[PDB]
């Protein structure tokens, strides 16, 4: 992981989530459960669908073609054909083979990027109202039920509503 | 996958440099270590040299008189040894290990014979031994030569079943010497004449010798 | 340094049985970084096991390691012809990285006795001023004692001996002791006798000759 | 060698050369440049 | 008490161009470009090339006296003439489809 | 620096460290010293060794090849040779020259990435138990000896062990 | 945004700033105003100017060239010309078209990178002396006039000078 998401601080991936690529694991008073963030996952797929499209769609330049067509009193010109034909085969193989290898590194890193930005989007909404575990989780200082947590996912979470509940829970431990 | 230099013969006090070229198409990624082995006795680790940075670590046993360098482009390690004694005479192996560290081993070299006795490259004196009165034994005595090896072709490969070539010994004189014998029935003792072909590569000494009963 | 001791130094086991090599460490071994290696005669070492118990790639399941802290054990379940060789443990937890001193594994056999022979010095060797008397022991199993007697007087300090590798087909050893003297000390005496002591013999066998006989 | 040129002969481990355009054999690719050096370490600061 | 993090640096001079910066001084490096040659023409996978010193192909097939046709090499990989070989044809003339025959004879097995 | 490691908040690199590419500088009560993180350095080298391998190994498609062989009554076809041969030379030079320039930027940025992730791995273990200086260092609120600091490198550092020592050191300064 | 700057936490860009690419918006007691960071902007332009240069300058390998010249009893050779000429056109178009698409993604992300590093450079100077809004702004706990704020831009901001002013403003709100 370039952004230190996937290989890094989120050691392993939730196998029980099967809605999207990126998402959340709530464990509050009502119960536990996975819930995938479909909006960020959609932008990733829109992106990847567009990469793959762009790698095929741009090469639309192809026309008619042929094979080999000279007699054995013109072997020199037949060798000039071979040089060119072998030549292109070398170029296209190389360019293709590498293009895959290159666009595959960045494609994987684009996912790292999306996951670290999702974790950062949650982190910035709830500054001191939760505790950064380091396994990429967030322990709440206050009670947050299933109707409260949609606000975190939606991104409509009120800091002032639950400010005093956490702040005065903080000095109790210290 | 690993290659080492050829045999070298130095006088005591004189220094020796040994090259282990790893491969590796590119700059090396693996920490070369070095392990010697004086004939008969076991393995003695010497020093390791990490891949990318060139920093070496040696054993407290040698430290002040051994240095191992690293040539990054060709991916070759070197091994220099200073003020050589009689007991430094040994086979030296390089060993690469699975990554720059260096910790476990995995791929071992070939080796390099290094003799430290200060002797002339004299040919081996082949003398005919006789059988003294079922199954009897007769063979070629190969005395006073330097240095290894000495491969022996009995009848140019015609009789090779039951031949025992003994490993040599260092004399008080300071010269190598070994024996070689073959068991054969009395049916062809005074009938088929047996002759051995002693080689010795470093002097080119080609002198055969007939073997007869007295 | 952390000194490693192996045991036992020689195992005598039949093809099929289990071998159990030990490796004790003078102090604990940092985080289970110990390795085993296998060396056959003439070849360079193989890796067997690293990290105490992890097999290396291209190795049967019969080789398996265990232990931790100070005591380590390498076990081989079904011995086969190819496994009879020397086995070295090394620690590589800290510099300097040391080896055990060789726990060999050899084939077990029915106790066979040595066919003792003797060779006087050749007439052509006495021309060069030195006299070599050879005393051969052929195809035996297992350790032995060879003593020289010149006019029934027990010699010591003027003889050296060489031993072959355990044979391919019958699993026996062969030995060749060589007594070295000047022509001045050879023509001094007459009776030259070689007394062999072995397990397979009920009493000590003696072979001899007198100087200038047919 | 694995390939030849009028000037000399080439090893052909690496994938580009700048020796001579007209070669015989499994040569790498002829490129009109003097330097193709690849980074492995990082920025060296004094 | 402190823990502070950082990255290696040594005494290397080897500059490397990048897409956004030029002449950047970097710790380690690898050459990708083969710049060197042994300067003496060699075998192609065990096969002796046919070297014609003072002689052309035409003069070698026919028995041009001035050069020698003692070359009893029964197999080759490529032919090596010189720029203008001194003995093309003692008796002046022309060779028909010379270039194609040249190509045919360029690599022979037996 | 893309990740703001090397050019950015860690202005300059430790020259005294010669074990690895990335690492630490401890200065506690027992003494000072550098100590390199070999595990992260190994992954970097495994990566770079593999890039360089991949740029050479993938072009293995190359075959037989030749030079020039037409007479001056066929100069048109000799010009067709030239067009093709010069044509490929243009492509390969361009593709090569750029490939280097491109993979060299990302190679440098991969190092930035590794260093910023290492600094982040330390930062997440010790949240309020140390002070983020901004030269990429960490001032401890509590005493941490040589046996304590192996836990930071190893990554086995106990937050609860030294929690009250720091927390109640914090309000002393905050007056 | 890869670095979560531009699309991400800084939703939209200051249109009233027209000095540089990246910059600051002060709103203190004296007044409001935009002020662009010219030093980081210069490095970006130095970089981009160099990318674009490098994509043109490296292809300097171009030579002489021609068009078509065969009779209709040599249509086979004319077809060999077409194959080669169409062949290169395919390669160059593809390589060009993609090169743009690739270098355009990274060019945009280089800007994200520069902005997130600038925000991080400010953030590390003033640790607890200001409040991270999350719109990418910083509310001060203490009064900082126009002469104080040049220190933030310049990067010479004293933590110890305004430490107690903020620290003891913090407990007033925490009731
Ligand atoms: C985004 O999430 C919030 C989470 O609260 C949603 O707000 C609630 O909408 C329900 C609908 O019945 C109402 O009961 C309340 O006004 C809100 N919930 C609570 C617990 O107060 C909001 O509807 C979501 N918005 C969008 C556009 O999807
Ligand atoms: C500096 O680099 C040179 C390269 O020639 C080398 O000889 C030397 O050992 C290095 N010196 C130091 C102090 O690191
Ligand atoms: C890069 O370095 C060389 C000297 O080795 C110099 O001639 C050249 O001016 C420099 N190039 C640029 C673009 O600054």
From TrEMBL, chain A:
Pfam families: Hemagglutinin. GO terms for molecular function: host cell surface receptor binding. One of its GO terms (biological process) is fusion of virus membrane with host plasma membrane. GO terms for cellular component: viral envelope. Disulfide bonds join 144-148. Signal peptide: none annotated. Residues 56-90 form a coiled coil. Glycans are attached at residue 154. Gene3D superfamilies: 3.90.20.10. This is Hemagglutinin HA2. It comes from unidentified influenza virus.
Automatic annotation (TrEMBL), chain D:
It is found in: Host apical cell membrane; Virion membrane. In natural infection, inactive HA is matured into HA1 and HA2 outside the cell by one or more trypsin-like, arginine-specific endoprotease secreted by the bronchial epithelial cells. One identified protease that may be involved in this process is secreted in lungs by club cells. Palmitoylated. Glycans are attached at residue 11. Disulfide bonds join 3-27. Binds to sialic acid-containing receptors on the cell surface, bringing about the attachment of the virus particle to the cell. This attachment induces virion internalization of about two third of the virus particles through clathrin-dependent endocytosis and about one third through a clathrin- and caveolin-independent pathway. Plays a major role in the determination of host range restriction and virulence. Class I viral fusion protein. Binds to sialic acid-containing receptors on the cell surface, bringing about the attachment of the virus particle to the cell. This attachment induces virion internalization either through clathrin-dependent endocytosis or through clathrin- and caveolin-independent pathway. Plays a major role in the determination of host range restriction and virulence. Class I viral fusion protein. Responsible for penetration of the virus into the cell cytoplasm by mediating the fusion of the membrane of the endocytosed virus particle with the endosomal membrane. Belongs to the influenza viruses hemagglutinin family. Homotrimer of disulfide-linked HA1-HA2. This is Hemagglutinin. It comes from Influenza A virus (strain A/Vietnam/1203/2004 H5N1). The gene is HA. The chain holds residues 292 to 337 of 568 of the full protein.
From TrEMBL, chains F, G:
One of its GO terms (cellular component) is viral envelope. Pfam families: Hemagglutinin. One of its GO terms (biological process) is fusion of virus membrane with host plasma membrane. One of its GO terms (molecular function) is host cell surface receptor binding. Keywords: Coiled coil, Viral penetration into host cytoplasm, Virus endocytosis by host, Virus entry into host cell. Residues 56-90 form a coiled coil. Glycans are attached at residue 154. SUPFAM superfamilies: Influenza hemagglutinin (stalk). InterPro entries: Hemagglutn_influenz_A/B (IPR001364), Hemagglutn_influenz_B (IPR000386). Disulfide bonds join 144-148. This is Hemagglutinin HA2. It comes from unidentified influenza virus.
């Amino acid at each position: 992981g370039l952004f230190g998401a996937i290989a890094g601080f989120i050691e392993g991936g939730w196998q029980g989530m099967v809605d999207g690529w990126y998402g959340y694991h709530h464990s509050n008073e009502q119960g536990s459960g996975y819930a995938a963030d479909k909006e960020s996952t959609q932008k990733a797929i829109d992106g990847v669908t567009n990469k793959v499209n762009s790698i095929i769609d741009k090469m639309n330049t192809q026309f008619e073609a042929v094979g080999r067509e000279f007699n054995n009193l013109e072997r020199r010109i037949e060798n000039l054909n071979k040089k060119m034909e072998d030549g292109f085969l070398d170029v296209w193989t190389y360019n293709a083979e590498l293009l895959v290898l290159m666009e595959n590194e960045r494609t994987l890193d684009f996912h790292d990027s999306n996951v670290k930005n999702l974790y950062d989007k949650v982190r910035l909404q709830l500054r001191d109202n939760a505790k950064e575990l380091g396994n990429g989780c967030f322990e709440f200082y206050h009670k947050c039920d299933n109707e409260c947590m949609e606000s975190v996912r939606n991104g409509t979470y009120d800091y002032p509503q639950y400010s005093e509940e956490a702040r005065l829970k903080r000095e109790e431990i210290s | 996958q690993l290659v080492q230099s050829g045999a070298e013969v130095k006088k005591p006090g004189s220094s020796v440099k040994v090259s282990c070229r790893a491969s590796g198409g590119i700059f090396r990624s693996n920490a070369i270590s070095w392990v010697r082995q004086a004939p008969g006795q076991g393995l003695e680790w010497m020093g390791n040299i990490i891949a990318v940075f060139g920093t070496a670590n040696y054993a407290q046993k040698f430290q002040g008189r051994v240095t191992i360098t690293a040539d990054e482009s060709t991916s070759t390690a070197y091994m220099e040894l200073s003020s050589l004694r009689s007991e430094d005479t040994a086979v030296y192996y390089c060993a690469r290990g699975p990554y720059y560290y260096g910790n476990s081993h995995d791929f071992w070299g070939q080796g390099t014979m290094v003799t430290v006795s200060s002797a002339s490259t004299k040919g081996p004196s082949v003398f005919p031994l006789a059988p003294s009165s079922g199954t009897a034994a007769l063979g070629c005595l190969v005395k006073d030569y330097f240095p290894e090896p000495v491969t022996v072709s009995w009848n140019s490969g015609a009789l090779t079943s039951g031949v025992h070539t003994f490993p040599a010994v260092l004399q008080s004189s300071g010269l190598y010497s070994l024996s070689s014998v073959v068991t054969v029935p009395s049916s062809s003792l005074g009938t088929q004449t047996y002759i051995c072909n002693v080689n010795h590569k470093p002097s080119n000494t080609k002198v055969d010798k007939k073997v007869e009963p007295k | 340094e952390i000194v490693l001791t192996q045991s036992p130094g020689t195992l005598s086991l039949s093809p099929g049985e289990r071998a159990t090599l030990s490796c004790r460490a003078s102090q604990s071994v940092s985080s289970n970084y110990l390795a085993w290696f296998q060396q056959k005669p003439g070849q360079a070492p193989r890796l067997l096991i690293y990290g105490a118990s992890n097999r290396a790639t291209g190795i049967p399941d019969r080789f398996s390691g265990s232990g931790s802290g100070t005591d380590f054990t390498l076990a081989i379940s079904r011995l086969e012809p190819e496994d009879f060789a020397v086995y070295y443990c090394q620690q590589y937890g800290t510099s300097p990285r040391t080896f055990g001193q060789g726990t060999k594994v050899e084939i077990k056999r029915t106790v066979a006795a040595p066919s003792v022979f003797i060779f006087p010095p050749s007439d052509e060797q006495l021309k060069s001023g030195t006299a070599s008397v050879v005393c051969l022991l052929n195809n035996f199993y297992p350790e032995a004692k060879v003593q020289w007697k010149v006019d029934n007087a027990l010699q010591s300090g003027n003889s050296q001996e060489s031993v072959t590798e355990q044979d391919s087909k019958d699993s026996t050893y062969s030995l060749s002791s060589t007594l070295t003297l000047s022509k001045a000390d050879y023509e001094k005496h007459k009776v030259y006798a070689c007394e062999v002591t072995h397990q397979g013999l009920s009493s000590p066998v003696t072979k001899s000759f007198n100087r200038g006989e047919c | 060698t694995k390939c030849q040129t009028p000037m000399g002969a080439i090893n052909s481990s690496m994938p580009f050369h700048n020796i001579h355009p007209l070669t015989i054999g499994e040569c790498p690719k002829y490129v009109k440049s003097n330097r193709l050096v690849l980074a492995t370490g990082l920025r060296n600061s004094p | 008490d402190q823990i502070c993090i950082g990255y290696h640096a040594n005494n290397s001079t080897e500059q490397v161009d990048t897409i956004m910066e030029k002449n950047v001084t970097v710790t380690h490096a690898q050459d990708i470009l083969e710049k060197k040659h042994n300067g003496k023409l060699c075998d192609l996978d065990g096969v002796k090339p046919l070297i014609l010193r003072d002689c052309s192909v035409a003069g070698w097939l026919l028995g041009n006296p001035m050069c020698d046709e003692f070359i009893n090499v029964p197999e080759w990989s490529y032919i090596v003439e010189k720029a203008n070989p001194v003995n093309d044809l003692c008796y002046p003339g022309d060779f028909n489809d010379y270039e194609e025959l040249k190509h045919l004879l360029s690599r022979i097995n037996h």
